[PDB]
Ligand SMILES: Nc1nc2c(ncn2[C@@H]2O[C@H](COP(=O)(O)OP(=O)(O)OP(=O)(O)O)[C@@H](O)[C@H]2O)c(=O)[nH]1
Ligand SMILES: Nc1nc2c(ncn2[C@@H]2O[C@H](COP(=O)(O)OP(=O)(O)OP(=O)(O)O)[C@@H](O)[C@H]2O)c(=O)[nH]1
Ligand SMILES: CC[C@H](C)[C@H](N)C(=O)O
């Protein structure tokens with residue numbers, strides 16, 4: 001299989017996945033496919049963001065890592081001292097991705113470590129392990145590109161998290177300020193007489209219980225929908241749901 | 254210079270660049286450097302998002318494209334018809350990135366076209382041109398890496414633009430529904446009359462209508478202005494719309 005074919009298999013995933021975000025679980029599968037490796041994609045603190053494992057599944061310690069969704073803290077710290085691609089690491093080296101207590105299985109194994117960088121900083125690590133053959137230039141071309149793309153994706157996720165929490169705050173503030181005082185009260189009555197932050201609403205039944213007009217209730221919900229703090233499909237009954245769960249607390253302030 | 258070394262140039266750019274967005278002029282320059290090519294990165298409609306040219310800078314036709322920030326419509330359409338990487342296109346093929354009126358100068362030229370896909374959609378095209386040497390599979394690995402990351406970046410930007418347009422739409426609707434009944438009728442008569450985007454308002458005239466007063470007009474106008482929908486100043490009062498997708502919307 002040509003390097004060009006291997007890169008195309010990875011790029012096809014990157015170009016055609018659904019949603020805005022690449023799923024690193026998928027990336028791990030594809031990297032494993034084109035390099036015939038055991039693959040970990042881990043965060044800075046060792047959370048397993050994706051894995052694609054074969055021979056490593058034999059090891060009971062590895063099985064436990066998958067359950068905990070974390071590599072050991074010791075290995076985590078070791079990876080963070082690797083600041084350059086280091087390849088063809090053997091089983092008696094502490095950077096090996098194989099369990100030393102299963103040395104006999106992995107006597108000829110090779111590990112390569114690819115730091116994941118973005119925004120000029122270390123965002124995680126991509127680790128590849130083979131039971132037999134050495135890694136070559138093709139493997140490093142694939143791995144370093146993959147690590148770069150994973151870094152881009154983490155950087156995007158991190159920025160979009162920061163942006164979203166800033167823009168949520170503003171949207172909630174705009175929403176709240178667009179309600180009349182009566183409407184603020186109606187919303188309080190609506191979510192009190194709902195099982196929390198969402199559920200099925202019968203406006204008439206709530207209006208009659210708290211002694212207000214359905215019109216005010218309908219108006220307030222319409223305002224919140226257009227503001228985008230709640231979703232609500234209008235089928236007897238109306239399901240409503242708060243998107244920004246910082247809303248109700250802010251509303252009472 | 255190994256292929257690994259060449260791919261590291263792009264990797265380093267992506268890992269180290271400042272700001273959230275990757276700059277496509279930077280990408281074009283980096284690709285140009287490692288493959289010794291003339292490089293265009295263009296949108297679906299042929300807008301030049303980034304370029305790095307050498308020999309093609311000598312063509313007055315190309316210069317005009319750069320000034321216009323667009324490749325020609327005809328070439329744009331031809332690029333969109335290319336659905337997968339097509340390499341080593343010669344000077345007599347309409348897909349050449351070279352000016353065919355300079356056929357002798359570019360007689361041995363080679364062009365490779367890299368569709369840019371992201372989010373399962375065609376988002377643009379990466380085009381490389383060499384005056385002499387054939388493209389090989391290492392060149393294609395480099396071009397297809399660059400095309401994929403450009404695609405990821407366009408996808409990110411388009412998603413931001415969708416969210417911005419949502420926020421803009423919400424701002425207008427919230428402004429409208431901040432208006433009381435009388436305030437809305439005042440505004441509706443004010444802009445219907447305003448003749449369009451500009452005009453001076455004599456509020457007294459609108460205030461002749463039953464249910465509308467001068468203070469109602471002031472209140473209605475201030476809500477819209479606070480929202481950033483309009484600007485105002487005092488004879489009478491001069492009104493300037495700043496989001497005429499508010500004139501539209503005010504009617505529904
Ligand atoms: N695009 C994408 N990003 C992911 C995926 N999984 C995790 N992330 C991002 O990767 C980063 C690290 O993941 P976290 O869940 O925060 O794990 P963590 O151990 O707290 O990360 P650190 O702060 O680096 O220690 C975060 O920015 C996540 O949003 C994924 O499948 N796809
Ligand atoms: N990250 C990044 N995005 C860019 C850059 N230049 C343009 N874009 C984005 O690329 C996309 C296409 O550019 P446009 O300005 O929309 O050009 P257009 O011809 O109207 O685009 P089409 O919708 O394809 O017709 C937009 O999402 C831009 O925001 C760049 O240098 N870096
Ligand atoms: C993924 C962790 C690996 C197995 C490491 N060599 C350890 O023994 O902990």
Ligand SMILES: CC[C@H](C)[C@H](N)C(=O)O
Pocket residue numbers: 324325328347348349350351352353
């Ligand atoms: C960039 C466009 C190129 C030169 C195309 N072959 C043309 O003649 O228009």
